[PDB]
Input
Amino acid sequence: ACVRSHCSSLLPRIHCA
Amino acid sequence: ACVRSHCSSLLPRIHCA
Amino acid sequence: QAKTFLDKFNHEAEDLFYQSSLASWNYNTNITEENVQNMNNAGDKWSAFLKEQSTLAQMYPLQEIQNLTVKLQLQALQQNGSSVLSEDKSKRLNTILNTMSTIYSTGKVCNPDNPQECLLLEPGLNEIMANSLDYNERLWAWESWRSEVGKQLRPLYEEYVVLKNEMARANHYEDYGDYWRGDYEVNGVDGYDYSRGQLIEDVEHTFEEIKPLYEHLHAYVRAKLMNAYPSYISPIGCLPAHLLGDMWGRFWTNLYSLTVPFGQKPNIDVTDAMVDQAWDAQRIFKEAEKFFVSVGLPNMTQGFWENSMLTDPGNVQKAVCHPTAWDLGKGDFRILMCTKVTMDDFLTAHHEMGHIQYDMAYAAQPFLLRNGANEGFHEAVGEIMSLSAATPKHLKSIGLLSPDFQEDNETEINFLLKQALTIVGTLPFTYMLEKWRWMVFKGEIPKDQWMKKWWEMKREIVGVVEPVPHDETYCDPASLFHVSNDYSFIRYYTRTLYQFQFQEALCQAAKHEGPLHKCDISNSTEAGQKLFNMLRLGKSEPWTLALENVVGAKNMNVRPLLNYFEPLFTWLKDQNKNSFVGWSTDWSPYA
Amino acid sequence: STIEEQAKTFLDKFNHEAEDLFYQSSLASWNYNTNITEENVQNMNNAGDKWSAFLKEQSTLAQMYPLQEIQNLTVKLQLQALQQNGSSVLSEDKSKRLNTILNTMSTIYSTGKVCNPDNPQECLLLEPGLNEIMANSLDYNERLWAWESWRSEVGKQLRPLYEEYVVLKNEMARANHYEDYGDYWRGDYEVNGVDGYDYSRGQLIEDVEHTFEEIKPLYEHLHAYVRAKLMNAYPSYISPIGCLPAHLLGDMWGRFWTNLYSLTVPFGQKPNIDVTDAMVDQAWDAQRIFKEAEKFFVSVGLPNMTQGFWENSMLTDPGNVQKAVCHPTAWDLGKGDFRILMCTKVTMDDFLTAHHEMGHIQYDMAYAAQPFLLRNGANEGFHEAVGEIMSLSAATPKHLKSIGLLSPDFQEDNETEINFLLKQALTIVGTLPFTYMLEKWRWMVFKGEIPKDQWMKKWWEMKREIVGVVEPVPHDETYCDPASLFHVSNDYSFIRYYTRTLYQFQFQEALCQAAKHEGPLHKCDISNSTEAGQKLFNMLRLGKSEPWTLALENVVGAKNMNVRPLLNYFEPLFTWLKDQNKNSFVGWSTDWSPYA
Ligand SMILES: *CCC(=O)N1CN(C(=O)CC*)CN(C(=O)CC*)C1
Ligand SMILES: *CCC(=O)N1CN(C(=O)CC*)CN(C(=O)CC*)C1
Output
């Protein structure tokens, strides 16, 4: 559900996007 | 492979329908 | 919103679908290049209307669709019509497809003993592989068929796999095998769902239970074939593949003469009676229709008796002589069967008439939902009928059998042993083939060992040993029609196990008492309404719910089949008590 | 008009507003991650929402154009991305549930606190409280308290949610005609319809496994030694023939044995190779370390960083005023905008991190040459492997000596060499069997091989059999030991770490062969090698435009992941370890436990 990654980390799903 | 069958057999693929 | 959309489709599809069905029937009844012209002309029309509708439905989201039956409808159209393949590749496949079908139909082998005299599978080669009792005669036929037609298909098959997979994977399916298995998949019905993996399990688990039963029939048949082919058969080794009463050992039915338990006992031959009462096709089909009416089922429509072809129409018009029930629509239904006065055709007629009954029952269902719950349901619905009619009781109730006979048991072993040579024998064959194809699709088998593996699996699962070493130049798998015509084959495993499950249920509803192998549902409103209940559904509900509606079970089961053959089992076991059972995979006739 | 053209008209209209929104979202996201404010969150959300919407409407509109009617290879790929990555496969309500499940499952891993029994009011969180003990503590009981407190006070709040998650995830994957969510995930490694470079989702499982069977010898012999030493730290707790208790491994999960070096160092007598002292004595700083990284990359022919990079990046903790998220993160904001977030510190470990983070920025810039949609890595394991190949060379004695952090009269002895390799393995060879088993479990769970009545039982059967790591206390189905990791609780794949590892050693094996390296690969510095920089740059620019199998062949001369490189890297360790354990027991009882 995401084509381009807006950075190289795997952020907490909570509060992000 | 195809919605509805018009018959109950499996006929050779050459001269099929 | 999409509802109305369906209405439009349904209304137009009918008129369009009918023309296509009629064109195919007409061509099958009368092989005229013009019939093909209209057939192909119409064929192209439906292929368009459908593809046209596909995108139109794809223009709707099933997610938003809260109504269920409509979603199931919509599912089909969108899950079809897409080319999902390079126009260059699409053509490459349709070609390979049609090429392999032709090579199978046109394939011809020439006896190096009469380099003039050449025979096609139908009926020259098949006649030798159904009736001959010479090793050398039977061998040349089996080998030449594969040493010529198969080796030629090999590289067509290789590319078949490649293009077939690419299309499957382009649809998110692991491979072509996983796509075919999707026939059985269910999602969205709590407590009725099923996985494309469950099948590969449910089929291997159940087969474990059949291995024993089979082991002895194989041991008994071998026991017997030894008398016929002493210098060519070992008591401990597999069965040479060319001596099994087919081109492929799909069935051993044509070995009953050499494997009859009690010889001088009353050979069931109601065919002679039928002659000695000057029977005809009208009698065979009419007799059946009464049985269906006897269980509470509708009478054949008039169009059936006036539009059906139940006899070969002479040299004045050629036809595709393959028993086949047709669902054309607008209420039109027909049976093409070059009928003859034989018990076989007698029973086949009921089988085909059952398909008609199923078609007529689900006819009320929405056009899209007018199909068997799964690929094996229809085949089973016909088999159960030929099963009830084969009962000594019905033969008397029909009076092709004189009420002088003693049901006896030597007779029940004679009746079961034959029923097995056609029902159980096919399962070690059905299973190992659909496996070997499934593996090749998943890609678990390298090209370099496609045949070595094929025969390792035959030798291991079916106790059958190719009588001549076969290099990787051959494509023996494709020497069988279904393989080389791109048709799934686990229908002939699911139906064989579904059939017994339905009968047992129907017989209990018919309050039948005693062995199931003697159950004739003839005259049973309850055992008919229950079956109808299932047929009427078509594919409106998951095959799981339907099977339960009938047999109270949500998944396939072998118990019913094992019960039907249990009496034979015991007899077999006893009969093989001195005999060694199983087979040494590392023996072959070239040893 | 032609479809292939109507498509162009659409993509061209799409890529125009895409570049604009992606930035607007990637920017507000940065503003938050650096200055956590209610407005920065609202702005972050309002943005990510507008984008997620645009992508959805564009994903739908995209399907209108079929691919078989497009010959142009490039607009095809682009379209496939928008069409294939078109979510909303699940019902509005089901979708709304899985989202709430994911949000709650993440809220509780981050908000999770274990209360020290000593203080029913005082309680510790994973960061910083619990991770500190599980990284430094040497008290079996104190390490076990936290280990259990984590799975028995939070893991149990997840078990129920993870079960519902596995259901909705499988519904969505199967709706896309996928076998399961695990197969959908292997989806990333799939290449369909490119004669010569094709990859099935099942080949990944066959490849993760066959490669692992070749790792067995090494990890077995590492395991042996680590168990032998841990004995001397816990002689009342450790079977000479058993698994390692899952609390005594220098991690909360035992993912890396990096913190067990203090007890595993082969020769503690030999001098340390850490140069944080030099960095301090030379008054280094964030700016200095990052500038030193740019030099390595320029040493190989890569571009210097942008002006906005040294102007908009945050390489130092903002302080008390601005509250920030200190996680080494490399951003691409779109429109030639690239920044790095790192609360850097003057340490050899934070210096090497920068080289890895900077390799990401090089990649992000390398494929700006590709259209927005192909502006991604070949696979989820490629971006990581890149950043790691740098730190692999940046932490070599050759490189340090020539940066002036190691005395130019330093001595590279067998003894110092082994201290290095060993510490490398604890972080590399160790996380491998841990990563393989974790995904292998999730796949089996999503496939359906593991019933909920034996989820935890299988988790520990596998941990024992594969990982030679036993649990200290027995656990029923009330626990969710796996879900006790951010990745699993936050819905993230994990094999990326198995794959990236195998690729990086293959990359170095080649980039070194390019720099005409002489001897053992572990002492290889690609610095000052344009040839190697070019070969890597060739692949770096491709991005998500070609089969990852091709990207690999372009830099390796071969099309599939391969372990033989990794084995050559640690070969000196392997050989010494075999000798070490000549008088120790190798392998393990699956059955033995602490509670036997
Ligand atoms: C397109 C989505 C994306 O870039 N990622 C998802 N994600 C989230 O945290 C979404 C809530 C993890 N990612 C990142 O950490 C990027 C900085 C990747
Ligand atoms: C819609 C296709 C269909 O009815 N069947 C599959 N099939 C073919 O595709 C024939 C070319 C075999 N079937 C028939 O021959 C019709 C009885 C069934």
Q: What stands out?
A: The longest strand of chain C covers residues 324-329. The radius of gyration of chain C is 24 Å. The longest helix of chain C spans residues 135-169.
